[PDB]
Amino acid sequence: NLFGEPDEGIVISRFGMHADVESADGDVHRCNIRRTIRSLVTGDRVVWRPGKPAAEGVNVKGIVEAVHERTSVLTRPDFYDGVKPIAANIDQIVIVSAILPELSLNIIDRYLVACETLQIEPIIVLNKIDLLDDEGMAFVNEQMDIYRNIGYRVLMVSSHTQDGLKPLEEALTGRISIFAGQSGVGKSSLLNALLGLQKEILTNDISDNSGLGQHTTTAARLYHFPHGGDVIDSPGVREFGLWHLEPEQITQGFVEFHDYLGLCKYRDCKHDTDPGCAIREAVEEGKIAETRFENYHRILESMAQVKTRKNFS
Amino acid sequence: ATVNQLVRKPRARK
Amino acid sequence: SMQDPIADMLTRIRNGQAANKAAVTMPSSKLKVAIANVLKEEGFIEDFKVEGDTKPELELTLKYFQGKAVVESIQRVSRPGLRIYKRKDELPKVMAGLGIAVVSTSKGVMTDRAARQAGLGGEIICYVA
RNA sequence: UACCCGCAGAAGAAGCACCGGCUAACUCCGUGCCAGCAGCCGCGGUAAUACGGAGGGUGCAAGCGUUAAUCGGAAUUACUGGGCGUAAAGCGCACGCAGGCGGUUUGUUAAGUCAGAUGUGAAAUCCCCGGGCUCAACCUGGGAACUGCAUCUGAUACUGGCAAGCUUGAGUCUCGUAGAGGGGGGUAGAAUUCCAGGUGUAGCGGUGAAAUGCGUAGAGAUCUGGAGGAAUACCGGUGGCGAAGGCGGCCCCCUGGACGAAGACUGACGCUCAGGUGCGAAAGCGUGGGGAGCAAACAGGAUUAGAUACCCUGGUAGUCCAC
RNA sequence: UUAGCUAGUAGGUGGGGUAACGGCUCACCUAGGCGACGAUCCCUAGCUGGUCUGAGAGGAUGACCAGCCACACUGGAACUGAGACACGGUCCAGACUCCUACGGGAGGCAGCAGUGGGGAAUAUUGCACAAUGGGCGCAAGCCUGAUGCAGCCAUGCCGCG
Ligand SMILES: Nc1nc2c(ncn2[C@@H]2O[C@H](COP(=O)(O)OP(=O)(O)NP(=O)(O)O)[C@@H](O)[C@H]2O)c(=O)[nH]1
Ligand SMILES: [Mg+2]
Ligand SMILES: [Mg+2]
Ligand SMILES: [Mg+2]
Ligand SMILES: [Mg+2]
Ligand SMILES: [Mg+2]
Ligand SMILES: [Mg+2]
Ligand SMILES: [Mg+2]
Ligand SMILES: [Mg+2]
Ligand SMILES: [Mg+2]
Ligand SMILES: [Mg+2]
Ligand SMILES: [Mg+2]
Ligand SMILES: [Mg+2]
Ligand SMILES: [Mg+2]
Ligand SMILES: [Mg+2]
Ligand SMILES: [Mg+2]
Ligand SMILES: [Mg+2]
Ligand SMILES: [Mg+2]
Ligand SMILES: [Mg+2]
Ligand SMILES: [Mg+2]
Ligand SMILES: [Mg+2]
Ligand SMILES: [Mg+2]
Ligand SMILES: [Mg+2]
Ligand SMILES: [Mg+2]
Ligand SMILES: [Mg+2]
Ligand SMILES: [Mg+2]
Ligand SMILES: [Mg+2]
Ligand SMILES: [Mg+2]
Ligand SMILES: [Mg+2]
Ligand SMILES: [Mg+2]
Ligand SMILES: [Zn+2]
C-alpha cells in the first residue's frame, strides 16, 4: 500500500518474489509485482509505482501494477512445466556458440525455426576460436559458409583475442539482443569485452568439466550498450520445444527451402520416403548441403518421439 | 511402563 | 518365571471360565488353599480337592449360569514388582460393594466385608469382580 | 463518625462487547481476493448475516473487552491412568557384575506391613456448626482436618532375615540320534581365461540396429597337453544348523551347542540386566602377498539436445589369503 | 555434552580454645575419607506454614499474613555488652558524591514518604500517640513513620441505586 507515481520503466531482471525495475533515467529500484500478473520477463516495459519511503530517502521496494503489450515474445514449452515465456520485446537475437565443449549444428537449426515464427533475425557468433589451428579454423569456416549462403550473417570472434568485436558492434547498436547458447559457450566473457561494464562483480564464471559445459550464470540480466540498445543474457539451455504448430511451419522455418517449395511431384510430401522430391533433388545437386537435409528429417523424426504422451497449453 | 524403570529415572516433563 | 504363583492361579481360573471348561488343575500350596477356600465360601466356585504329597496338585470345579461366566473378571492387585498395602479404613471395594477384595491379614484370609468386624488391614490379593 | 430524624422532586446517577460455525442472536446497503477481517475453520474478484455502515437483537454490567502469565481441558511423560508388527518407538546379537525379583514345607525373628495408645504436627487459611457488622464481602467461637513423624504394647497370614528341609524349577551322568556349527590341513572334476601344439578358413565378436575391438603373424571353432585363480551344478526342498550377521564339493583332525530314551544324583543352585565385555553382512583403511573371471574411477564406440547413466568392447582399485 | 574428588582433608594422642561438644586451632601419628542410593563441578533459587488449579492423585508458585535464616554502599576485622561480628556503633581499604582557606573532612533511604532513572506498569514530600504492643522510669510523664488512621489508584471482592 501507499504507492507512488505511475510511470513507464524497463524491468531489469526477474526474481519471482520481486523484480528489478529501471526508471526513466537509470535508477536501479527493485519492486514486487501484482498478484493478477500472469507473467513478467526481462526487459518488459511496465506501469509501476515506487512505493513510499518510510525513512526520508530510504525506501525498500515499490510495486509493478500493469504490463504493457508485447512486441515479440520468446515462448518455449517444457515437459511438466507448460509453455513459459523467457524474454520479450526484442528486435534481434544473437546466437552465441563456442568450439568448446562441442559445436553442434542441430542446436543452430531449431532457433532458426523459432525466429521464423517471431520475425526476428538471428546472428551466428562463434567464440573460443583462438585455440584452433588454421587447418581447423578453415574447416569451421567451411561449415559456416553454408550458413552464409542462406542469408544469415556470420561473425567469428574470440573474447581472449578481441578479434572482430568492432564489426560485431556496428550491426548491433539500436537494438536489444539475446545472447542465446548452450552451457559454457562464452556468453559472459563476450559481455566483458563489448560493454566495459562494472568490474566489481563482472560475472559468475564457473564452467569446468571433463568434456562438458556448466551453466553458472542465471536467466537474464539487463545492461546497456555504450552507444544504444540493451543486452539480454541467456541460460545454458539444452531444450527443444516444438509443441507450437504443425509441421507445415517446420517447412517455413528454413530460408532457402522457401524458394524450392511447390516444385515436387505431389501437393503434399513427407520429403523422405516420397519418390520425386524436388527438395531432395536439390540436396543431391549440391546446392543444399546434406548436413542440413539429414538434420531436417531428424527434426521431423524428433516430433515422432516428443509427441508420444501428450502436451497442450 | 514398568514401575521399577521409573525408580532410576522418572517421566521427563517437557 | 513362576514368581507370582497367585497370578498363575488367577490365569488358570480366568481361561477355563471363559473357554467352557468343566474343571481345572494346578500345583497346590498353602496360600492357594487359603484363597480357594474363601472363593468356595463366597459362591464363586464349587469344590476343591488336593492330590499328591510330594507334588501337591490342587483342583478346582468351575461354575456357570447357563454356560455364562460366573467370575466375569478378576484383577491381580499387588505383585512382586509392587506391593500394595492398605489400612482398616482404606480398604477398597469392588463394584461399589458387589465384588469382594481378598485381603490377607493376621487373622487369616478374609474379605473386606469380613474385615469390618475384624478391624484390620494388610495385603490386597485380588479383586474378585 | 456509623446510625437516626426532616425536607424537595424521578428530579443527581448505564455503558461495553458480540451477532458464519465453535458460542447466545438476521436482515439490508456499500465495497470487489483490492481494502480489510481473524483465536481456530478460513471469509471477500459482482447476491459477503464473516469487510465497512445502518436497523434490530444477544451476553454482561459500574464496569466491559483485549494482551501477557499459571493450571485445567491434555489419559499430550499416562503412580492412579499411555504405547513400541506397519502411525514416533524392542538396542544387530550374546555373556555377565551391581540392582530388581523369586518354587515348595516347617520353625524362629517381628524388619516391612497391620491394630491400639502416648507425645507431636504454632497460629492463621480451607472444611462443620454457630455468633457479630442492616446484608454480603469480611471478622470470629469451638470442633474437624492437617492423610506426617517418633515411641510403646500387640497380632503372625503375606513379604524380608535366620535355621532345617523337600523336588516339579534349574543342573549332572550314561546310552544314543541328526545337522552347510566353527577353525585348521589336504584333495577332486567341470567351467572361465592364459600358454604350447595340431587340423582347419573369412570372418569372429557384440546389439533393437550398429560401431569400438579382434583376426590371414590364421582368429573364431575343434582336439591334445600344461599353468594359475576363484566358486562348488544336480542333490536342494516356507529343508536343516547357529545368539545373530550368517553357514553348501568331498575327506581327515581339533572343537562348540541342540534334542530324545531309561534311571541315578545336587537341592532354588533361578530369571533378568544400566555401565562393562565379546561376536558382528558388505563397502572402506594400514602392511605384505595374490590375480582367472566379474568390476567403482577411467579408456573407447553407439545412443542423445547433451550421455556424464543406460547398451557394448576393454580395464585399475577392490573382490582372494595372512595380520 | 560434570566420574573421580579431597592433605587440616579422614581418624587418633597431647596442648590451646569457646558459654557448651568438636580439626574449632596447633605439633605429632595413621592413610584413610567421600562417591553411581550422584561425590565433585557448573547454572538457577530464600525456605516453610500456604495460595491457585484440579473429581482426586498430582501440577505451578512462595506478593499481602505468620514462622525461620541471610543481608544493611563493596570487602575485611575486632571492641562493647547477658545477648551483634552490630540497618540509623566504631576501625581499615576501595568506589561514588558533597564541604573546603587545598592540608583535609563528611556521607550511606533494601525505615516512613518523596525525587531522578529503569520498565507495559504500582501512591501523599498527610494526621495522631485516642487505642494496642514495645522502650525508659517508683509512678506521673516522655518516645515509637511500629501500629492506629486519612488521601490517591473502579486494583480486587461484596452490596445498593
Ligand atoms: N581461450 C579462450 N577462452 C575463452 C574465450 N571466451 C571465453 N573463454 C573462456 O571460456 C569459459 C566460459 O565462459 P563463460 O562466458 O563463463 O561461459 P558462459 O557461456 O557464460 N557460461 P554460462 O552458461 O554459465 O553462462 C571462461 O573460462 C572463459 O574465460 C576465448 O575466446 N578464448
Ligand atoms: Mg555466463
Ligand atoms: Mg446459534
Ligand atoms: Mg467488526
Ligand atoms: Mg455484492
Ligand atoms: Mg459490582
Ligand atoms: Mg499463552
Ligand atoms: Mg495429563
Ligand atoms: Mg497414545
Ligand atoms: Mg514408524
Ligand atoms: Mg533383533
Ligand atoms: Mg515363642
Ligand atoms: Mg495452625
Ligand atoms: Mg483455631
Ligand atoms: Mg477460621
Ligand atoms: Mg447473616
Ligand atoms: Mg518366609
Ligand atoms: Mg578349467
Ligand atoms: Mg537328597
Ligand atoms: Mg586405501
Ligand atoms: Mg562399468
Ligand atoms: Mg586391501
Ligand atoms: Mg583434642
Ligand atoms: Mg508489612
Ligand atoms: Mg517474613
Ligand atoms: Mg550478622
Ligand atoms: Mg557489618
Ligand atoms: Mg539508614
Ligand atoms: Mg520504602
Ligand atoms: Mg525509562
Ligand atoms: Zn517433396
PDB file of N, CA, C and O in Angstrom, chain C residues 53-102:
ATOM      1  N   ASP C  53       1.324 -85.637  47.712  1.00  0.00           N
ATOM      2  CA  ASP C  53       2.001 -85.062  48.865  1.00  0.00           C
ATOM      3  C   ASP C  53       3.421 -84.600  48.572  1.00  0.00           C
ATOM      4  O   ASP C  53       3.867 -83.613  49.167  1.00  0.00           O
ATOM      5  N   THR C  54       4.138 -85.279  47.677  1.00  0.00           N
ATOM      6  CA  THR C  54       5.437 -84.802  47.222  1.00  0.00           C
ATOM      7  C   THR C  54       5.318 -83.896  46.004  1.00  0.00           C
ATOM      8  O   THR C  54       6.250 -83.138  45.707  1.00  0.00           O
ATOM      9  N   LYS C  55       4.188 -83.964  45.295  1.00  0.00           N
ATOM     10  CA  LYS C  55       3.844 -82.991  44.255  1.00  0.00           C
ATOM     11  C   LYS C  55       2.400 -82.536  44.460  1.00  0.00           C
ATOM     12  O   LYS C  55       1.469 -83.123  43.909  1.00  0.00           O
ATOM     13  N   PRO C  56       2.185 -81.508  45.282  1.00  0.00           N
ATOM     14  CA  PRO C  56       0.816 -81.115  45.647  1.00  0.00           C
ATOM     15  C   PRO C  56       0.061 -80.503  44.475  1.00  0.00           C
ATOM     16  O   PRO C  56       0.440 -79.459  43.939  1.00  0.00           O
ATOM     17  N   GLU C  57      -1.021 -81.167  44.080  1.00  0.00           N
ATOM     18  CA  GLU C  57      -1.810 -80.785  42.917  1.00  0.00           C
ATOM     19  C   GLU C  57      -3.203 -80.369  43.373  1.00  0.00           C
ATOM     20  O   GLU C  57      -3.950 -81.188  43.919  1.00  0.00           O
ATOM     21  N   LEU C  58      -3.546 -79.102  43.158  1.00  0.00           N
ATOM     22  CA  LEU C  58      -4.858 -78.592  43.524  1.00  0.00           C
ATOM     23  C   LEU C  58      -5.791 -78.645  42.319  1.00  0.00           C
ATOM     24  O   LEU C  58      -5.374 -78.452  41.176  1.00  0.00           O
ATOM     25  N   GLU C  59      -7.067 -78.901  42.593  1.00  0.00           N
ATOM     26  CA  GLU C  59      -8.090 -78.995  41.563  1.00  0.00           C
ATOM     27  C   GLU C  59      -9.210 -78.028  41.912  1.00  0.00           C
ATOM     28  O   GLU C  59      -9.491 -77.803  43.090  1.00  0.00           O
ATOM     29  N   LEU C  60      -9.831 -77.442  40.892  1.00  0.00           N
ATOM     30  CA  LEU C  60     -10.974 -76.561  41.082  1.00  0.00           C
ATOM     31  C   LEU C  60     -12.112 -76.966  40.158  1.00  0.00           C
ATOM     32  O   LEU C  60     -11.898 -77.232  38.971  1.00  0.00           O
ATOM     33  N   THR C  61     -13.319 -77.005  40.713  1.00  0.00           N
ATOM     34  CA  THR C  61     -14.530 -77.211  39.935  1.00  0.00           C
ATOM     35  C   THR C  61     -15.087 -75.858  39.519  1.00  0.00           C
ATOM     36  O   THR C  61     -15.246 -74.958  40.348  1.00  0.00           O
ATOM     37  N   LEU C  62     -15.382 -75.715  38.229  1.00  0.00           N
ATOM     38  CA  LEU C  62     -15.838 -74.440  37.691  1.00  0.00           C
ATOM     39  C   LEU C  62     -17.313 -74.225  38.033  1.00  0.00           C
ATOM     40  O   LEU C  62     -17.950 -75.031  38.718  1.00  0.00           O
ATOM     41  N   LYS C  63     -17.878 -73.124  37.544  1.00  0.00           N
ATOM     42  CA  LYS C  63     -19.245 -72.757  37.880  1.00  0.00           C
ATOM     43  C   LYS C  63     -19.789 -71.866  36.774  1.00  0.00           C
ATOM     44  O   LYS C  63     -19.104 -70.945  36.327  1.00  0.00           O
ATOM     45  N   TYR C  64     -21.016 -72.150  36.338  1.00  0.00           N
ATOM     46  CA  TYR C  64     -21.621 -71.456  35.209  1.00  0.00           C
ATOM     47  C   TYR C  64     -23.054 -71.089  35.571  1.00  0.00           C
ATOM     48  O   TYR C  64     -23.574 -71.498  36.614  1.00  0.00           O
ATOM     49  N   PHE C  65     -23.702 -70.307  34.705  1.00  0.00           N
ATOM     50  CA  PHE C  65     -25.063 -69.843  34.957  1.00  0.00           C
ATOM     51  C   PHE C  65     -26.055 -70.431  33.961  1.00  0.00           C
ATOM     52  O   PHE C  65     -26.995 -71.115  34.376  1.00  0.00           O
ATOM     53  N   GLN C  66     -25.867 -70.205  32.663  1.00  0.00           N
ATOM     54  CA  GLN C  66     -26.435 -71.042  31.603  1.00  0.00           C
ATOM     55  C   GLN C  66     -25.347 -71.318  30.573  1.00  0.00           C
ATOM     56  O   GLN C  66     -25.565 -71.246  29.363  1.00  0.00           O
ATOM     57  N   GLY C  67     -24.148 -71.635  31.054  1.00  0.00           N
ATOM     58  CA  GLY C  67     -22.971 -71.549  30.216  1.00  0.00           C
ATOM     59  C   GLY C  67     -22.356 -70.170  30.200  1.00  0.00           C
ATOM     60  O   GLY C  67     -21.595 -69.844  29.282  1.00  0.00           O
ATOM     61  N   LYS C  68     -22.674 -69.347  31.193  1.00  0.00           N
ATOM     62  CA  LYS C  68     -22.185 -67.983  31.291  1.00  0.00           C
ATOM     63  C   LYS C  68     -21.204 -67.904  32.451  1.00  0.00           C
ATOM     64  O   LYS C  68     -21.355 -68.605  33.456  1.00  0.00           O
ATOM     65  N   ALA C  69     -20.194 -67.051  32.297  1.00  0.00           N
ATOM     66  CA  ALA C  69     -19.116 -66.920  33.269  1.00  0.00           C
ATOM     67  C   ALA C  69     -19.627 -66.302  34.565  1.00  0.00           C
ATOM     68  O   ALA C  69     -20.120 -65.169  34.567  1.00  0.00           O
ATOM     69  N   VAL C  70     -19.506 -67.050  35.664  1.00  0.00           N
ATOM     70  CA  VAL C  70     -19.857 -66.515  36.976  1.00  0.00           C
ATOM     71  C   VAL C  70     -18.828 -65.480  37.413  1.00  0.00           C
ATOM     72  O   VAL C  70     -19.161 -64.323  37.693  1.00  0.00           O
ATOM     73  N   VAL C  71     -17.561 -65.881  37.473  1.00  0.00           N
ATOM     74  CA  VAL C  71     -16.475 -64.932  37.684  1.00  0.00           C
ATOM     75  C   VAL C  71     -16.185 -64.267  36.345  1.00  0.00           C
ATOM     76  O   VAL C  71     -15.526 -64.852  35.477  1.00  0.00           O
ATOM     77  N   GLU C  72     -16.700 -63.049  36.159  1.00  0.00           N
ATOM     78  CA  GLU C  72     -16.567 -62.372  34.871  1.00  0.00           C
ATOM     79  C   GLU C  72     -15.141 -61.885  34.642  1.00  0.00           C
ATOM     80  O   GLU C  72     -14.562 -62.118  33.574  1.00  0.00           O
ATOM     81  N   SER C  73     -14.553 -61.217  35.632  1.00  0.00           N
ATOM     82  CA  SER C  73     -13.185 -60.732  35.519  1.00  0.00           C
ATOM     83  C   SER C  73     -12.567 -60.691  36.908  1.00  0.00           C
ATOM     84  O   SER C  73     -13.259 -60.442  37.899  1.00  0.00           O
ATOM     85  N   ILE C  74     -11.264 -60.960  36.974  1.00  0.00           N
ATOM     86  CA  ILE C  74     -10.531 -60.890  38.232  1.00  0.00           C
ATOM     87  C   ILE C  74      -9.196 -60.208  37.959  1.00  0.00           C
ATOM     88  O   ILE C  74      -8.602 -60.362  36.887  1.00  0.00           O
ATOM     89  N   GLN C  75      -8.767 -59.385  38.916  1.00  0.00           N
ATOM     90  CA  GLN C  75      -7.655 -58.461  38.732  1.00  0.00           C
ATOM     91  C   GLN C  75      -6.653 -58.669  39.853  1.00  0.00           C
ATOM     92  O   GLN C  75      -6.968 -58.436  41.023  1.00  0.00           O
ATOM     93  N   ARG C  76      -5.458 -59.126  39.495  1.00  0.00           N
ATOM     94  CA  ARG C  76      -4.355 -59.154  40.442  1.00  0.00           C
ATOM     95  C   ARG C  76      -3.932 -57.728  40.766  1.00  0.00           C
ATOM     96  O   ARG C  76      -3.672 -56.929  39.863  1.00  0.00           O
ATOM     97  N   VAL C  77      -3.866 -57.404  42.057  1.00  0.00           N
ATOM     98  CA  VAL C  77      -3.636 -56.033  42.514  1.00  0.00           C
ATOM     99  C   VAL C  77      -2.203 -55.844  42.996  1.00  0.00           C
ATOM    100  O   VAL C  77      -1.433 -55.088  42.399  1.00  0.00           O
ATOM    101  N   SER C  78      -1.827 -56.513  44.081  1.00  0.00           N
ATOM    102  CA  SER C  78      -0.436 -56.482  44.488  1.00  0.00           C
ATOM    103  C   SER C  78       0.348 -57.513  43.688  1.00  0.00           C
ATOM    104  O   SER C  78      -0.208 -58.448  43.112  1.00  0.00           O
ATOM    105  N   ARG C  79       1.659 -57.331  43.648  1.00  0.00           N
ATOM    106  CA  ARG C  79       2.515 -58.122  42.780  1.00  0.00           C
ATOM    107  C   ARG C  79       3.927 -58.074  43.347  1.00  0.00           C
ATOM    108  O   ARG C  79       4.232 -57.198  44.164  1.00  0.00           O
ATOM    109  N   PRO C  80       4.793 -59.035  42.986  1.00  0.00           N
ATOM    110  CA  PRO C  80       6.184 -58.976  43.470  1.00  0.00           C
ATOM    111  C   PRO C  80       6.962 -57.754  43.001  1.00  0.00           C
ATOM    112  O   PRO C  80       7.933 -57.374  43.665  1.00  0.00           O
ATOM    113  N   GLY C  81       6.565 -57.118  41.898  1.00  0.00           N
ATOM    114  CA  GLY C  81       7.209 -55.884  41.489  1.00  0.00           C
ATOM    115  C   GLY C  81       6.739 -54.660  42.247  1.00  0.00           C
ATOM    116  O   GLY C  81       7.461 -53.657  42.289  1.00  0.00           O
ATOM    117  N   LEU C  82       5.548 -54.714  42.842  1.00  0.00           N
ATOM    118  CA  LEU C  82       4.999 -53.563  43.559  1.00  0.00           C
ATOM    119  C   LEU C  82       3.997 -54.072  44.586  1.00  0.00           C
ATOM    120  O   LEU C  82       2.933 -54.576  44.213  1.00  0.00           O
ATOM    121  N   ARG C  83       4.329 -53.930  45.867  1.00  0.00           N
ATOM    122  CA  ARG C  83       3.457 -54.374  46.944  1.00  0.00           C
ATOM    123  C   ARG C  83       2.447 -53.290  47.297  1.00  0.00           C
ATOM    124  O   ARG C  83       2.779 -52.102  47.337  1.00  0.00           O
ATOM    125  N   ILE C  84       1.211 -53.709  47.557  1.00  0.00           N
ATOM    126  CA  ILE C  84       0.110 -52.807  47.876  1.00  0.00           C
ATOM    127  C   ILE C  84      -0.400 -53.147  49.269  1.00  0.00           C
ATOM    128  O   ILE C  84      -0.710 -54.310  49.554  1.00  0.00           O
ATOM    129  N   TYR C  85      -0.486 -52.136  50.132  1.00  0.00           N
ATOM    130  CA  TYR C  85      -0.998 -52.311  51.481  1.00  0.00           C
ATOM    131  C   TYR C  85      -1.945 -51.169  51.811  1.00  0.00           C
ATOM    132  O   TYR C  85      -1.724 -50.023  51.411  1.00  0.00           O
ATOM    133  N   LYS C  86      -3.008 -51.492  52.546  1.00  0.00           N
ATOM    134  CA  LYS C  86      -3.990 -50.507  52.974  1.00  0.00           C
ATOM    135  C   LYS C  86      -4.260 -50.684  54.460  1.00  0.00           C
ATOM    136  O   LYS C  86      -3.903 -51.697  55.066  1.00  0.00           O
ATOM    137  N   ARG C  87      -4.907 -49.682  55.047  1.00  0.00           N
ATOM    138  CA  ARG C  87      -5.273 -49.701  56.452  1.00  0.00           C
ATOM    139  C   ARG C  87      -6.685 -50.256  56.615  1.00  0.00           C
ATOM    140  O   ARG C  87      -7.324 -50.695  55.657  1.00  0.00           O
ATOM    141  N   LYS C  88      -7.178 -50.231  57.855  1.00  0.00           N
ATOM    142  CA  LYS C  88      -8.501 -50.762  58.163  1.00  0.00           C
ATOM    143  C   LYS C  88      -9.634 -49.888  57.639  1.00  0.00           C
ATOM    144  O   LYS C  88     -10.774 -50.362  57.578  1.00  0.00           O
ATOM    145  N   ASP C  89      -9.359 -48.639  57.266  1.00  0.00           N
ATOM    146  CA  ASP C  89     -10.373 -47.744  56.732  1.00  0.00           C
ATOM    147  C   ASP C  89     -10.133 -47.358  55.280  1.00  0.00           C
ATOM    148  O   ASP C  89     -10.970 -46.661  54.692  1.00  0.00           O
ATOM    149  N   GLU C  90      -9.020 -47.787  54.685  1.00  0.00           N
ATOM    150  CA  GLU C  90      -8.725 -47.532  53.283  1.00  0.00           C
ATOM    151  C   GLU C  90      -8.889 -48.782  52.429  1.00  0.00           C
ATOM    152  O   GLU C  90      -8.288 -48.877  51.355  1.00  0.00           O
ATOM    153  N   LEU C  91      -9.679 -49.743  52.892  1.00  0.00           N
ATOM    154  CA  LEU C  91      -9.922 -50.963  52.133  1.00  0.00           C
ATOM    155  C   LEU C  91     -10.821 -50.665  50.942  1.00  0.00           C
ATOM    156  O   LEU C  91     -11.956 -50.209  51.132  1.00  0.00           O
ATOM    157  N   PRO C  92     -10.366 -50.894  49.715  1.00  0.00           N
ATOM    158  CA  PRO C  92     -11.195 -50.572  48.551  1.00  0.00           C
ATOM    159  C   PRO C  92     -12.271 -51.619  48.317  1.00  0.00           C
ATOM    160  O   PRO C  92     -12.099 -52.804  48.614  1.00  0.00           O
ATOM    161  N   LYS C  93     -13.394 -51.163  47.778  1.00  0.00           N
ATOM    162  CA  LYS C  93     -14.491 -52.035  47.398  1.00  0.00           C
ATOM    163  C   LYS C  93     -14.417 -52.332  45.906  1.00  0.00           C
ATOM    164  O   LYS C  93     -13.818 -51.585  45.128  1.00  0.00           O
ATOM    165  N   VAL C  94     -15.037 -53.441  45.515  1.00  0.00           N
ATOM    166  CA  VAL C  94     -15.070 -53.884  44.128  1.00  0.00           C
ATOM    167  C   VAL C  94     -16.505 -53.787  43.638  1.00  0.00           C
ATOM    168  O   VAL C  94     -17.401 -54.416  44.216  1.00  0.00           O
ATOM    169  N   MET C  95     -16.705 -53.007  42.567  1.00  0.00           N
ATOM    170  CA  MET C  95     -18.023 -52.676  42.007  1.00  0.00           C
ATOM    171  C   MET C  95     -18.952 -52.092  43.071  1.00  0.00           C
ATOM    172  O   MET C  95     -20.093 -52.531  43.233  1.00  0.00           O
ATOM    173  N   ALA C  96     -18.428 -51.110  43.814  1.00  0.00           N
ATOM    174  CA  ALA C  96     -19.125 -50.355  44.863  1.00  0.00           C
ATOM    175  C   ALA C  96     -19.706 -51.246  45.958  1.00  0.00           C
ATOM    176  O   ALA C  96     -20.731 -50.908  46.557  1.00  0.00           O
ATOM    177  N   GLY C  97     -19.072 -52.385  46.236  1.00  0.00           N
ATOM    178  CA  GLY C  97     -19.544 -53.309  47.246  1.00  0.00           C
ATOM    179  C   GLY C  97     -20.115 -54.605  46.714  1.00  0.00           C
ATOM    180  O   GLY C  97     -20.434 -55.491  47.514  1.00  0.00           O
ATOM    181  N   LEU C  98     -20.258 -54.751  45.396  1.00  0.00           N
ATOM    182  CA  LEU C  98     -20.764 -56.000  44.838  1.00  0.00           C
ATOM    183  C   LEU C  98     -19.688 -57.079  44.853  1.00  0.00           C
ATOM    184  O   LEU C  98     -19.851 -58.128  45.486  1.00  0.00           O
ATOM    185  N   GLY C  99     -18.581 -56.836  44.157  1.00  0.00           N
ATOM    186  CA  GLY C  99     -17.462 -57.748  44.223  1.00  0.00           C
ATOM    187  C   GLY C  99     -16.719 -57.641  45.540  1.00  0.00           C
ATOM    188  O   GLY C  99     -16.857 -56.677  46.293  1.00  0.00           O
ATOM    189  N   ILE C 100     -15.907 -58.656  45.817  1.00  0.00           N
ATOM    190  CA  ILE C 100     -15.148 -58.717  47.055  1.00  0.00           C
ATOM    191  C   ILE C 100     -13.667 -58.556  46.740  1.00  0.00           C
ATOM    192  O   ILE C 100     -13.203 -58.835  45.631  1.00  0.00           O
ATOM    193  N   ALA C 101     -12.927 -58.084  47.739  1.00  0.00           N
ATOM    194  CA  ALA C 101     -11.488 -57.882  47.635  1.00  0.00           C
ATOM    195  C   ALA C 101     -10.807 -58.780  48.654  1.00  0.00           C
ATOM    196  O   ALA C 101     -11.017 -58.626  49.862  1.00  0.00           O
ATOM    197  N   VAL C 102      -9.996 -59.714  48.168  1.00  0.00           N
ATOM    198  CA  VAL C 102      -9.351 -60.693  49.033  1.00  0.00           C
ATOM    199  C   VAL C 102      -8.163 -60.033  49.720  1.00  0.00           C
ATOM    200  O   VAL C 102      -7.195 -59.635  49.066  1.00  0.00           O
TER     201      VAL C 102
END
